Design a protein around this ligand. Sequence first.
Ligand SMILES: *[C@@H]1O[C@H](CO)[C@@H](O[C@@H]2O[C@H](CO)[C@@H](O[C@@H]3O[C@H](CO)[C@@H](O)[C@H](O)[C@@H]3O)[C@H](O)[C@H]2NC(C)=O)[C@H](O)[C@H]1NC(C)=O
Ligand SMILES: *[C@@H]1O[C@H](CO)[C@@H](O[C@@H]2O[C@H](CO)[C@@H](O)[C@H](O)[C@H]2NC(C)=O)[C@H](O)[C@H]1NC(C)=O
Ligand SMILES: *[C@@H]1O[C@H](CO)[C@@H](O[C@@H]2O[C@H](CO)[C@@H](O)[C@H](O)[C@H]2NC(C)=O)[C@H](O)[C@H]1NC(C)=O
Ligand SMILES: *[C@@H]1O[C@H](CO)[C@@H](O[C@@H]2O[C@H](CO)[C@@H](O)[C@H](O)[C@H]2NC(C)=O)[C@H](O)[C@H]1NC(C)=O
Ligand SMILES: *[C@@H]1O[C@H](CO)[C@@H](O[C@@H]2O[C@H](CO)[C@@H](O)[C@H](O)[C@H]2NC(C)=O)[C@H](O)[C@H]1NC(C)=O
Ligand SMILES: *[C@@H]1O[C@H](CO)[C@@H](O[C@@H]2O[C@H](CO)[C@@H](O)[C@H](O)[C@H]2NC(C)=O)[C@H](O)[C@H]1NC(C)=O
Ligand SMILES: *[C@@H]1O[C@H](CO)[C@@H](O)[C@H](O)[C@H]1NC(C)=O
Ligand SMILES: *[C@@H]1O[C@H](CO)[C@@H](O)[C@H](O)[C@H]1NC(C)=O
Ligand SMILES: *[C@@H]1O[C@H](CO)[C@@H](O)[C@H](O)[C@H]1NC(C)=O
Ligand SMILES: *[C@@H]1O[C@H](CO)[C@@H](O)[C@H](O)[C@H]1NC(C)=O
Ligand SMILES: *[C@@H]1O[C@H](CO)[C@@H](O)[C@H](O)[C@H]1NC(C)=O
Ligand SMILES: *[C@@H]1O[C@H](CO)[C@@H](O)[C@H](O)[C@H]1NC(C)=O
Lengths: 136, 137, 134, 417, 415
Amino acid sequence: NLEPVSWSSLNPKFLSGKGLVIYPKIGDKLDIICPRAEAGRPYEYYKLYLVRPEQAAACSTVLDPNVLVTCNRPEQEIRFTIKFQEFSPNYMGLEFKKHHDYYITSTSNGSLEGLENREGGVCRTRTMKIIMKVGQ
Amino acid sequence: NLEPVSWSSLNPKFLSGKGLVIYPKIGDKLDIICPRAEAGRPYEYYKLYLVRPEQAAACSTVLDPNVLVTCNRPEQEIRFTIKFQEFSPNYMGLEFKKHHDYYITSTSNGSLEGLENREGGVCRTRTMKIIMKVGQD
Amino acid sequence: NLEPVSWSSLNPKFLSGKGLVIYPKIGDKLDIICPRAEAGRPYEYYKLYLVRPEQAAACSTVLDPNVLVTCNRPEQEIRFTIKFQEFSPNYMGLEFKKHHDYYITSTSNGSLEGLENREGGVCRTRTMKIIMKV
Amino acid sequence: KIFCKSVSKDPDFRLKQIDYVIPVQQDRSICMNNPLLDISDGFFTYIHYEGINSCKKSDSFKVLLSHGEIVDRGDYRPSLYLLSSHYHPYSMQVINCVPVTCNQSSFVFCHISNNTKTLDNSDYSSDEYYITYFNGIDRPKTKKIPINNMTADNRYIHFTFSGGGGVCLGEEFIIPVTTVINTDVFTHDYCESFNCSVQTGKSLKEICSESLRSPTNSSRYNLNGIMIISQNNMTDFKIQLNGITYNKLSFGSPGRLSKTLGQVLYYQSSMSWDTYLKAGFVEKWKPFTPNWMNNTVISRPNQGNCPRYHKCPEICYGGTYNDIAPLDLGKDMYVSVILDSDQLAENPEITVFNSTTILYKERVSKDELNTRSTTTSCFLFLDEPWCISVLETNRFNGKSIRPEIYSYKIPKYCGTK
Amino acid sequence: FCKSVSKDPDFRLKQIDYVIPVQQDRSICMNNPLLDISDGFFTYIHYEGINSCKKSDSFKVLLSHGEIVDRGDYRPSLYLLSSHYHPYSMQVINCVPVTCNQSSFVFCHISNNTKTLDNSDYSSDEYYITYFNGIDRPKTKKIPINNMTADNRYIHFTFSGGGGVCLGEEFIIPVTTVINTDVFTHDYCESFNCSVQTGKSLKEICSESLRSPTNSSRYNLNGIMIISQNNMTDFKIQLNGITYNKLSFGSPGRLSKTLGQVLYYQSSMSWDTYLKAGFVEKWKPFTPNWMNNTVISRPNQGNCPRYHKCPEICYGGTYNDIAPLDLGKDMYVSVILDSDQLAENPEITVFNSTTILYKERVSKDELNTRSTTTSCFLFLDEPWCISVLETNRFNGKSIRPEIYSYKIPKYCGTK
Ligand SMILES: *[C@@H]1O[C@H](CO)[C@@H](O[C@@H]2O[C@H](CO)[C@@H](O[C@@H]3O[C@H](CO)[C@@H](O)[C@H](O)[C@@H]3O)[C@H](O)[C@H]2NC(C)=O)[C@H](O)[C@H]1NC(C)=O
Ligand SMILES: *[C@@H]1O[C@H](CO)[C@@H](O[C@@H]2O[C@H](CO)[C@@H](O)[C@H](O)[C@H]2NC(C)=O)[C@H](O)[C@H]1NC(C)=O
Ligand SMILES: *[C@@H]1O[C@H](CO)[C@@H](O[C@@H]2O[C@H](CO)[C@@H](O)[C@H](O)[C@H]2NC(C)=O)[C@H](O)[C@H]1NC(C)=O
Ligand SMILES: *[C@@H]1O[C@H](CO)[C@@H](O[C@@H]2O[C@H](CO)[C@@H](O)[C@H](O)[C@H]2NC(C)=O)[C@H](O)[C@H]1NC(C)=O
Ligand SMILES: *[C@@H]1O[C@H](CO)[C@@H](O[C@@H]2O[C@H](CO)[C@@H](O)[C@H](O)[C@H]2NC(C)=O)[C@H](O)[C@H]1NC(C)=O
Ligand SMILES: *[C@@H]1O[C@H](CO)[C@@H](O[C@@H]2O[C@H](CO)[C@@H](O)[C@H](O)[C@H]2NC(C)=O)[C@H](O)[C@H]1NC(C)=O
Ligand SMILES: *[C@@H]1O[C@H](CO)[C@@H](O)[C@H](O)[C@H]1NC(C)=O
Ligand SMILES: *[C@@H]1O[C@H](CO)[C@@H](O)[C@H](O)[C@H]1NC(C)=O
Ligand SMILES: *[C@@H]1O[C@H](CO)[C@@H](O)[C@H](O)[C@H]1NC(C)=O
Ligand SMILES: *[C@@H]1O[C@H](CO)[C@@H](O)[C@H](O)[C@H]1NC(C)=O
Ligand SMILES: *[C@@H]1O[C@H](CO)[C@@H](O)[C@H](O)[C@H]1NC(C)=O
Ligand SMILES: *[C@@H]1O[C@H](CO)[C@@H](O)[C@H](O)[C@H]1NC(C)=O
């Protein structure tokens, strides 16, 4: 198991320049909680895409990136558990393997108006990208 | 009959350099008792290999050396009776004959973790090797 | 005399599974020529071990197996004559006698880098073993 | 008709793993994935894909096709005897295959294409479809299916054999297939009848129409169906393609047809919003109408907005394939290796269940085991009900991934351990 | 005849010395004898080697054909008729005798590699039938293993046993097969309530105990070979494996025609040190009705000596044929070794499934004996037996097996 990652604009683990770097070994669990209705009633709506390093640097996604998980409900604690095995019950396989890199980001505008804004968004403004270089 | 050889790391008959040499005649009995549960609870697990002089000197075994006897149970007094007759009930015949040499060793680590470690082990650290030159003196 | 056995990876007498078996009687000659410099200049470097059947199957040699003959020079046709007499001018005696088994192999990689490779080599890749039940 | 049919704990399935059927690759980069198994009349057909450093189906350089037999070894249990094993001649172009064991022989129905994404940008006239068939003695032979002389009940634009097995009825083969069509010709009374929270974006009629769309082609829809192939001893083929009933539609997904207990059972993997078991016996063939069960206890894990036990309509994609096998028709009993996890594909459990209650279950492994899909087939052996399941396992970490076969017996008595 | 527990039985034991040849070379060891008797004719086989008693390490293999003849002695005598050496003796891995239709038949496995069973396959080796009688010169025909059908994925095999059986036009020979995958179950072994070894579990212990001790990747499984033919023409060869019920590591077996039934014996070279034997119920799969014998075992060194019961990764044992005398009274006779670990003190033993009825030592002095074979038959309306013992009475000098003839005692306790 690993430390779950609360995915909100009010989370310190996202370094201002490097994002959130993780070095998970094979066979580890890792939760990615999208936040509940936060105390402050700031409805936080995101849409996460499994992406490649190049377009994660450019912070743009074409139609081919698959909507990994969407934080639709504000009240319900929607989540996304990860085990770094090869097989995943997700469309398009999403093989984790070993000695690879895995980047998770959101390009969305903070609210539901830009929920499906895929052009820019949080990927560069707040740099909320989870980068997982598995292995040493 | 001959004097049995207790096979434990606490046995003096294993000379620090020459091991334990025996000169038995044909038709002699000789037991090789692997020890019971010792007092101080030092569980002793070994696996004995009938070997050739060259790899008994080098203290390494390939797959062909036959597991002569293994000291599996710690409580039960496992043993191994030997008569130096020609015919033996062991796989691969194992004729004793006369004026031959017969070498017995173990490559095992002290505990069960390296029970089947065949690279080094007790053969060179403590030199617990039994060499049996049949003949008179 | 017997038919010499050319020792190269390019020899058909080495059956793909059974190696090369010979049934020589006592007092016969038998040469084992290690190859000259082949035409296409593919330098063939081996190191032959007189071995026992047990480690001949596993194709591994410890330090005690004696390097029977080594194919150092590529141009010079180095060879190895055998008479199946008892006495031989070799270190460690090498008594032939009769009704015995005698296995000769090489664990070497094709080239000089693995000349002294004793772990695997041609003994299992090409099964170039000479087995002699006299 | 003499086995445990009640709610009980600690069942004795007499579980044993079979390792000698599926080959073991020496190369660590090989992924053995997507296993399929179909048993019929004491013979089986096993299929799986092999790829290099990737376990994706069309990303496979070898596709193994195995034919075999069930044999008694005096073991008081059935044993798998592998008879023939061949590689597909067009493996590097295989998009999907479905096995059928007909008349004690193996038959493999495959779709071959130059484009691994052919279902998103092409049509079936641009691809080829083959039947590879063989047994224990004859060399495998592959014949091209004449899709030109095919009759269809609707304006389908594409199709692939997708499922865990097919069925032989007389001289006709019935293979599960997933079709692609680019116009909304469907109705959704069942989905539109749900009393769920209305999503602020779209209406329920829009949600239900769009949930049938391909997730990679907003203009295409994936609809399940069957293919009926009749022929005169591999001559003068007559091929028909019929779609599934519009009652309780679910997004196109690999299915299965099985001959069990004198009936024909259809299974559909739940890859959309209805995360509960889609299965049923076939009433009519045109349209392909399975009598859908009202199962309230069998589901499957998935990440995202539709995890295990999700019921409400939602534009979702993802899920796991988990075959079922009927045990008693009168008692409405079934067995299946399902995944005991809400979102992750792990912890396979042999589960004997009702339509309304789970009867008994057992984990396959004491350690955590990754399993993406399971298939199960049951049959009478020595006057007793026995079952064999195949799991696409990853027991070693990463590396050489390979499925596993397990054999087990339905417990004679309840609560024996 | 005597069917009760008693002492001092009168077997009228007599040794036969004129059958087995006497080699002039004192260094030669004559080892591994085999004997099969049928319809008053016998077939004897043994191996001859120089300063070594190993089977494949043999330069001569003797094959003898003979007849049972009455000499007016009120007991059977062995009459040696023909005696020849196998043409491929220096390449013989194993042979099995069968006396069919009053003639001798020898089924041998020949290979250039004495370790063929550890690193090769059966396509690389050859298998022959040598047959002859009292008048015809011996003829050797090669068995077409190419036209053989097998019930499983065997990679190698050798004729291994003390005898075979002739049924009509079919020969049934005991065989030990080789396979490179663990296709076996061990419900019988897994059912034992024994001390758990601290290293591995019982399922692992029982799986691994079927492996070859010299090739960790290989498994040795016993079975039979059925060879039917039209007067050495149009061979039909079938290879069937033994039942998975009560599996024991591959070992030399035997098939014998006795008392209207077919008895299979399997030497106990693993953890189950008690007698493995039984009559054949079905042929596919090869199912012998295993006996539940609690009194007959054999000596062996190592972790499985005499009377050892618990599953354990063991290898070793002695071959000791049995012969039924009366099936209803469940009586059997066998020359077993009365020692826990050493191969010595052979004893003719008439026994129950649950009790030993009576016994007698073969020699009053200690006698080394590596294996025994026994065959019984009706002679003068009485049950008589002939046994061959792989003896070593002259320690240090040459080795030669011994033949004994004896009668089941008519009355109990007569001396
Ligand atoms: C112990 O016994 C096993 C089986 O009895 C031996 O394993 C098998 O050995 C054979 C050769 O004797 C291997 O066959 C070769 O495999 C290569 C693989 O590419 C192939 O190219 C050759 O044409 C030939 O078929 C076989 O592969 C091997 N088993 C497996 C599963 O691969 C083993 O070598 C024996 N070991 C010792 C030390 O005796
Ligand atoms: C054992 O090895 C020898 C090695 O020569 C084999 O002898 C030759 O085998 C080939 C092909 O099998 C035949 O064409 C030759 O005729 C054989 N030699 C002679 C002199 O006839 C031999 O066949 C192998 N097997 C046996 C059983 O001997
Ligand atoms: C999504 O599917 C639609 C429907 O087929 C595709 O649109 C067709 O594309 C083909 C090939 O480019 C054209 O020949 C057709 O004229 C298009 N229209 C129709 C109605 O078929 C669309 O290209 C697909 N999206 C992709 C491939 O990204
Ligand atoms: C079995 O086959 C053998 C060999 O083919 C037969 O023996 C010979 O057959 C020929 C016929 O061409 C006769 O002329 C010979 O006299 C036969 N030899 C002997 C020694 O009789 C034999 O007849 C066949 N049938 C059997 C043995 O029953
Ligand atoms: C030794 O005990 C076993 C165990 O009961 C006996 O095996 C039975 O054999 C009969 C023979 O037809 C079968 O019907 C039974 O099914 C077997 N038992 C089981 C549990 O399956 C065996 O018969 C006994 N030995 C003898 C000589 O009878
Ligand atoms: C040997 O097995 C037989 C069964 O085949 C046992 O049979 C009877 O046991 C009683 C018990 O004392 C005896 O009185 C009988 O004489 C035995 N025989 C018969 C035909 O009934 C016998 O008990 C077993 N041997 C021993 C020593 O008990
Ligand atoms: C994000 O995009 C939407 C698209 O309509 C826009 O309305 C909104 O102002 C943008 N910025 C936000 C939500 O902060
Ligand atoms: C023996 O082998 C084990 C294998 O784990 C190793 O840990 C140990 O250090 C070795 N030596 C011992 C036990 O002396
Ligand atoms: C053989 O061994 C040598 C040892 O240095 C190695 O360099 C070489 O790559 C090996 N293989 C060959 C020569 O094919
Ligand atoms: C199966 O379902 C029926 C009703 O659907 C129910 O009455 C029965 O109790 C269930 N089975 C068990 C074992 O509870
Ligand atoms: C298979 O069996 C059915 C039985 O009805 C028969 O009609 C058919 O001709 C057989 N052969 C094939 C190829 O289906
Ligand atoms: C032996 O005799 C029987 C009948 O007498 C016959 O069927 C058989 O073919 C003969 N030959 C052999 C080898 O059994």
